[PDB]
Amino acid sequence: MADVKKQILDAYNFRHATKEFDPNKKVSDSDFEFILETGRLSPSSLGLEPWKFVVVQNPEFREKLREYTWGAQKQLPTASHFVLILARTAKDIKYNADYIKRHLKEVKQMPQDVSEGYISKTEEFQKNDLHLLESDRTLFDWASKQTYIALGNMMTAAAQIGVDSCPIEGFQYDHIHRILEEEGLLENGSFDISVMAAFGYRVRDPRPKTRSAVEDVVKWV
Amino acid sequence: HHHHMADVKKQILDAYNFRHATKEFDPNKKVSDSDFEFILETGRLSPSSLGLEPWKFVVVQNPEFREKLREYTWGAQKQLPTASHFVLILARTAKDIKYNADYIKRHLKEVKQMPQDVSEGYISKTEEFQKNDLHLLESDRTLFDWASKQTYIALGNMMTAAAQIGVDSCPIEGFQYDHIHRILEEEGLLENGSFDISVMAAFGYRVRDPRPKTRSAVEDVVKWV
Ligand SMILES: Cc1cc2nc3c(=O)[nH]c(=O)nc-3n(C[C@H](O)[C@H](O)[C@H](O)COP(=O)(O)O)c2cc1C
Ligand SMILES: Cc1cc2nc3c(=O)[nH]c(=O)nc-3n(C[C@H](O)[C@H](O)[C@H](O)COP(=O)(O)O)c2cc1C
Ligand SMILES: [Cl-]
Ligand SMILES: [Mg+2]
Numbered sequence: 001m002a003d004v005k006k007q008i009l010d011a012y013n014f015r016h017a018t019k020e021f022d023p024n025k026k027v028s029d030s031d032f033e034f035i036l037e038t039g040r041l042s043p044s045s046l047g048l049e050p051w052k053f054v055v056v057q058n059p060e061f062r063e064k065l066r067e068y069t070w071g072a073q074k075q076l077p078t079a080s081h082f083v084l085i086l087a088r089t090a091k092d093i094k095y096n097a098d099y100i101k102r103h104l105k106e107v108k109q110m111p112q113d114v115s116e117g118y119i120s121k122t123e124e125f126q127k128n129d130l131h132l133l134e135s136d137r138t139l140f141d142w143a144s145k146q147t148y149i150a151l152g153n154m155m156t157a158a159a160q161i162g163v164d165s166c167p168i169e170g171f172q173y174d175h176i177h178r179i180l181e182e183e184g185l186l187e188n189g190s191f192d193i194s195v196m197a198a199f200g201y202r203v204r205d206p207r208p209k210t211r212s213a214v215e216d217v218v219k220w221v
Numbered sequence: 222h223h224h225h226m227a228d229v230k231k232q233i234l235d236a237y238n239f240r241h242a243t244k245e246f247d248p249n250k251k252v253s254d255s256d257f258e259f260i261l262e263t264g265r266l267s268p269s270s271l272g273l274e275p276w277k278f279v280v281v282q283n284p285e286f287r288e289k290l291r292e293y294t295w296g297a298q299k300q301l302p303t304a305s306h307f308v309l310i311l312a313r314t315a316k317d318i319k320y321n322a323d324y325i326k327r328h329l330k331e332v333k334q335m336p337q338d339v340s341e342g343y344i345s346k347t348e349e350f351q352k353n354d355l356h357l358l359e360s361d362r363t364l365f366d367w368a369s370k371q372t373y374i375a376l377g378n379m380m381t382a383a384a385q386i387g388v389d390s391c392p393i394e395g396f397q398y399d400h401i402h403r404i405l406e407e408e409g410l411l412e413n414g415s416f417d418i419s420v421m422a423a424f425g426y427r428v429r430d431p432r433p434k435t436r437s438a439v440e441d442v443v444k445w446v
């Protein structure tokens with residue numbers, strides 16, 4: 001698979017945490033729809049797809065976010081596209097929530113017979129397997145983990161088509177939460193902010209990428 | 222160059238459609254050593270918050286150890302025995318990824334090559350980030366789950382990369398934490414409390430094709446502002 005592998009690893013080395021984008025270079029509609037598709041097609045635990053990708057293009061709303069997003073001071077103004085990745089809350093992804101039943105039926109096409117058992121399994125899984133019901137936050141964080149699959153996928157896919165990105169956690173939750181809630185974007189408590197991601201074209205190449213040695217992050221048994 | 226661009230997108234989306242949660246692999250078909258090294262590299266090269274790389278990829282090839290895990294991994298009953306390669310993705314614990322931990326200092330100095338003024342500032346930023354920005358110090362588990370989120374980036378990447386080279390996978394959360402934790406602890410895999418289990422992933426070759434993939438319509442998971 002030598003050619004494919006090289007192309008992919010070149011994209012992994014292309015992708016970096018871009019701090020500033022070219023404000024005059026926009027990702028095409030087609031390319032951005034492809035990036036979003038890699039998010040949409042991502043896998044998720046129990047197939048629940050507990051995410052929403054909010055594409056904030058409005059400059060004024062970006063600036064509202066920027067006040068409380070220390071990690072995106074240049075990324076927010078300059079990005080071609082800027083995404084808030086939301087995750088479902090306990091309201092919607094506790095085992096007995098209506099969202100789960102509707103998703104399994106309407107999206108996953110899971111028969112009613114089958115979903116009864118699947119939701120019973122989900123219940124035991126959340127309570128006793130992974131202890132996800134420890135708190136409402138524990139359960140949100142579980143949903144949020146699924147969103148990080150989508151995050152990783154979207155950034156990598158972007159890089160493979162020559163589009164830079166930057167994942168962003170550097171924000172003040174309390175303030176971002178309020179802003180999104182008041183804007184309506186959390187859908188009556190269905191969602192909360194998980195992670196942000198900018199997309200666009202770099203202005204300068206970065207310094208060489210650094211990572212742990214393979215022997216320090218891989219072990220064979 | 223436009224056709225090539227379009228073909229890159231097509232081939233990637235084909236891989237996204239190829240990848241599925243494979244329930245059973247072919248026990249007679251192994252991923253090559255070279256192919257699996259590539260898959261691991263996509264994990265290693267993944268980004269992480271604060272660059273901390275708070276993961277370990279444990280490749281469990283030993284069939285007896287797989288079987289020990291199987292007892293307590295309801296979500297991998299056929300995947301454990303049949304997979305070509307099986308990975309336990311571990312995440313760093315509070316011991317190592319709280320702002321004031323030695324792991325962070327060493328990582329910033331030796332991997333990230335920061336001079337001390339820069340790492341001191343970075344660690345100060347990390348402290349405020351954990352305490353007050355994202356409230357990660359609510360509990361040891363809050364902090365662990367933050368490290369675990371980073372590992373899900375690597376999980377996603379590895380599975381997608383595998384699919385791009387025709388290798389099936391299955392992500393796995395369906396396990397009893399208490400028992401898996403003990404099994405890995407007793408084997409020495411958690412490195413004296415440095416790590417805990419985050420998520421599992423199997424790799425190999427399918428034995429049958431899945432049913433069509435289902436996902437939410439794009440208009441229901443994307444909103445423009
Ligand atoms: C983090 C995670 C954990 C999962 N755990 C299991 C599991 O234990 N066993 C399993 O068979 N499938 C597992 N799944 C697979 C999901 O059910 C599957 O990804 C989802 O329904 C979407 O289907 P697809 O991956 O075939 O596209 C898991 C998925 C993810 C992302
Ligand atoms: C979830 C996540 C959150 C991050 N938050 C920020 C951020 O707020 N601002 C920033 O400039 N970089 C941010 N980073 C980028 C990391 O510092 C960077 O990914 C890491 O040092 C590895 O470098 P690379 O991505 O350039 O390969 C974040 C990374 C991840 C994965
Ligand atoms: Cl366009
Ligand atoms: Mg246009």
Ligand SMILES: [Mg+2]
Nearest residue numbers: 224225227228
């Ligand atoms: Mg062609």
